[PDB]
């Protein structure tokens, strides 16, 4: 069982402590169910967040091997370039030896510039890898270095230290009643299958029902714009001048719960979730963002909806344990 510690920034960003090369170069890395590569800085990027961000150097590893594979990958919040390279990675007290990464070129945009992590650790299905590189989870698997294919994570709530994403096991401390297990939809991303949405016996959102998947990496709750501006509507959200989607802090204490059914068992976010408070400013924990998919216009459970939920990913098994949070 390997146990990573995971810092909550703001409840918005959940990053732990990795480690690369012998002796081993220090990297902060969020912990990503939505994606699958594993990657840092390079001492061979020249890109604006690469001069604030720690970079590996690949001659002060003595474990470090090169190959000639290029990575390019595209995220919903822009790109990197780099190449893969082999070495010892120590995540959550393991010691995964030879795990493929990618050792960044370019990182354009401001928005890794100001980002307090380093790099990602992809968590997701080998299936949505770039260039086909082994993930971190896999490789630990095909190593023995976990007992259980599966991997639980819990994220806190209030900026409290205690997030943390469990390799190869379960801590039944962290949650209450039995887990419910969810067939996963699509492998690829941890992709369910979404009955509806509710708010008093009424169908909100999602009829007929829809596709979501579980992120880690993303903080709130999202939908298709079209169907996010129905429930936007319904909680009391306007847009402000500013762009933000704004509500009053007073509706946390009147909204009722929205319920998300799935696999036939409803799960309940109340309005003390889904409405994010911020000295006197309290704004929507639901956005706007189509995200098209050959099955769908995808559903993102966020951070949001993580941090009521202790979640169990189980590759042994393709399933999703769900259960609310102790």
Same mark, same amino acid.
């Given at each position: 069982?390997?146990?990573?510690?995971?810092?909550?920034?703001?409840?918005?960003?959940?990053? =732990?402590? /990795?480690? /690369?090369?012998?002796? !081993?170069?220090?990297?902060?890395? +969020?912990?990503?169910?939505?994606?699958?590569?594993?990657?840092?800085?390079?001492?061979?990027?020249?890109?604006?967040?690469?001069?604030?961000?720690?970079?590996?150097?690949?001659?002060?590893?003595?474990?470090?091997?090169?190959?000639?594979?290029?990575?390019? +990958?595209?995220?919903?919040?822009? *790109? #990197?370039? =780099? +190449?893969?390279?082999?070495?010892?990675?120590?995540?959550?007290?393991?010691?995964?030896?030879?795990?493929?990464?990618?050792?960044?070129?370019?990182?354009?945009?401001?928005?890794?510039?100001?980002?307090?992590?380093?790099?990602?650790?992809?968590?997701?299905?080998? *299936?949505? @890898? !770039? @260039?086909? !590189?082994?993930?971190?989870?896999?490789?630990?698997?095909?190593?023995?270095?976990?007992?259980?294919?599966?991997?639980?994570?819990?994220?806190?709530?209030?900026?409290?230290? &205690?997030?943390?994403?469990?390799?190869?096991? $379960?801590? @039944? *401390?962290?949650?209450?009643?039995?887990?419910?297990?969810?067939?996963?939809?699509?492998?690829?991303?941890?992709?369910?299958?979404?009955? @509806?949405?509710? #708010?008093?016996?009424?169908?909100?959102?999602?009829?007929?029902?829809?596709? !979501?998947?579980?992120?880690?990496?993303?903080?709130?709750?999202?939908?298709?714009?079209?169907?996010?501006?129905? $429930?936007?509507?319904?909680?009391?959200? *306007?847009?402000?001048?500013? &762009?933000? #989607?704004? $509500?009053?802090?007073?509706?946390?204490?009147?909204?009722?719960?929205?319920?998300?059914?799935?696999?036939?068992?409803?799960?309940?976010?109340?309005?003390?979730?889904?409405?994010?408070?911020?000295?006197?400013?309290?704004?929507?924990?639901?956005?706007? #963002?189509?995200?098209?998919?050959?099955?769908?216009?995808?559903?993102?459970? &966020?951070?949001?909806? $993580?941090?009521?939920?202790?979640?169990?990913?189980?590759?042994?098994?393709?399933?999703?344990?769900?259960?609310?949070?102790?």
């Amino acid at each position: 069982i390997g146990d990573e510690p995971l810092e909550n920034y703001l409840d918005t960003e959940y990053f =732990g402590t /990795i480690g /690369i090369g012998t002796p !081993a170069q220090d990297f902060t890395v +969020i912990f990503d169910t939505g994606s699958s590569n594993l990657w840092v800085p390079s001492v061979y990027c020249s890109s604006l967040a690469c001069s604030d961000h720690n970079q590996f150097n690949p001659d002060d590893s003595s474990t470090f091997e090169a190959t000639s594979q290029e990575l390019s +990958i595209t995220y919903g919040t822009g *790109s #990197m370039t =780099g +190449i893969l390279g082999y070495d010892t990675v120590q995540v959550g007290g393991i010691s995964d030896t030879n795990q493929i990464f990618g050792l960044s070129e370019t990182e354009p945009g401001s928005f890794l510039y100001y980002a307090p992590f380093d790099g990602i650790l992809g968590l997701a299905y080998p *299936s949505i @890898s !770039a @260039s086909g !590189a082994t993930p971190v989870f896999d490789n630990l698997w095909d190593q023995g270095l976990v007992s259980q294919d599966l991997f639980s994570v819990y994220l806190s709530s209030n900026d409290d230290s &205690g997030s943390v994403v469990l390799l190869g096991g $379960i801590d @039944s *401390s962290y949650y209450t009643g039995s887990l419910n297990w969810v067939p996963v939809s699509v492998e690829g991303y941890w992709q369910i299958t979404l009955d @509806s949405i509710t #708010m008093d016996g009424e169908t909100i959102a999602c009829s007929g029902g829809c596709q !979501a998947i579980v992120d880690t990496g993303t903080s709130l709750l999202t939908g298709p714009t079209s169907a996010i501006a129905n $429930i936007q509507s319904d909680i009391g959200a *306007s847009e402000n001048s500013d &762009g933000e #989607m704004v $509500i009053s802090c007073s509706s946390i204490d009147s909204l009722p719960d929205i319920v998300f059914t799935i696999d036939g068992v409803q799960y309940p976010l109340s309005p003390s979730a889904y409405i994010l408070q911020d000295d006197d400013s309290c704004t929507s924990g639901f956005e706007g #963002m189509d995200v098209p998919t050959s099955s769908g216009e995808l559903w993102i459970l &966020g951070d949001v909806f $993580i941090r009521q939920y202790y979640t169990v990913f189980d590759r042994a098994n393709n399933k999703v344990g769900l259960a609310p949070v102790a």
